[PDB]
Design a protein around this ligand. Structure first.
Ligand SMILES: [Fe+3]
Ligand code: NI
Ligand code: NI
Lengths: 143, 143, 139
């Protein structure tokens, strides 16, 4: 049990449990509800954050972990699939204790407070295809 | 008078009056329209901002007020009810004149320019319960 | 060609082509689809960003790799012409965030946006006291 939720039409209001890794939980939620595609938005507070910064020129990537209290001012992302497997693409903006903002591609975050997310289910297959030139999985609406 | 609006299906486009405190206005809007739960998202510009940072370890909190021109790059939040009243939980990301970003839990903001918000009405009850161990008002899908 | 898309009910999932200017692409999408009003939200990666800061009483271009943590905006019209009001928050290679009014941005990676079509005319009126185009729901 990583969350509780309420279904309202095509949306789920998801309350993630405290001290839970949010990305793991959102993936679990989408797998347990069989969500094909959709959006994820929300807010909350965290005690750990890992962001990834990808360099398209060299293909190097940097994963930075912050270990401090932060407020999620916005988590924005989408749901799709690859080979029928849930694929989340989530970005995030957070505020530190001095109100300065950090932002980027979200890999993980550990809740420390509330975690209030809206998951909209589009009920529609949306797939991605790996682009070997970019090293990225890009939307592919015709597959 | 604090705002003008347009109803479009399950949403309202809300244009807050200039020089008006946005949180007060959004509360008043939701109250006027009897919105039990929903979401709020938008953008605009402000001349004053108050954010709160809560320390879960000591239960200290601080409220910081900025008195300068800022752009709201994103205001994100949700609507629910608590103690017979509208309950708004809003976070925000703002840009300063040097384009640096601040982020956090929004208490108030005074518009100075435009204020353009989308309010979705879920037409369903979502309440909250204060968790005395955390010191936070947490979604309660049962009450 | 600046994008590909998928229509899902009242929404469009828009994938902007790499190396494209996103504001121009989004404007082009809204004109092609005849969108009267709506919302735009999404994420992606960019190599150039121009932000504007309006003094009610300045533009700056950043030339570096950035992640768009959020792009938030709306669609309306003035004199039947598509009007996009877009703000943005980005992360730099040191993870610090920049935020503001979006003039333009060049994609360098993915560009994944959800465009909701409201199917309703929403206009604006120039307010000369402010120097801004403000929503006018009665016109
Ligand atoms: Fe603006
Ligand atoms: Ni909060
Ligand atoms: Ni290329």
């Amino acid at each position: 049990n990583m969350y509780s939720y309420k279904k309202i039409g095509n949306k789920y209001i998801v309350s993630i449990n405290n001290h839970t890794e949010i990305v793991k939980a959102l993936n679990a939620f989408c797998k347990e509800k069989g969500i094909l595609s959709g959006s994820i938005n929300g807010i909350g507070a965290i005690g750990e954050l890992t962001l990834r910064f990808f360099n398209p020129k060299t293909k190097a990537y940097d994963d930075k972990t912050f270990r401090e209290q932060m407020e999620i001012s916005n988590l924005t992302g989408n749901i799709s699939s690859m080979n029928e497997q849930v694929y989340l693409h989530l970005h995030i903006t957070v505020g530190r204790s001095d109100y300065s903002a950090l932002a980027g591609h979200l890999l993980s975050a550990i809740q420390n407070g509330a975690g209030e997310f809206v998951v909209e289910d589009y009920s529609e297959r949306i797939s991605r295809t790996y682009n070997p030139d970019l090293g990225l999985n890009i939307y592919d609406f015709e597959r």
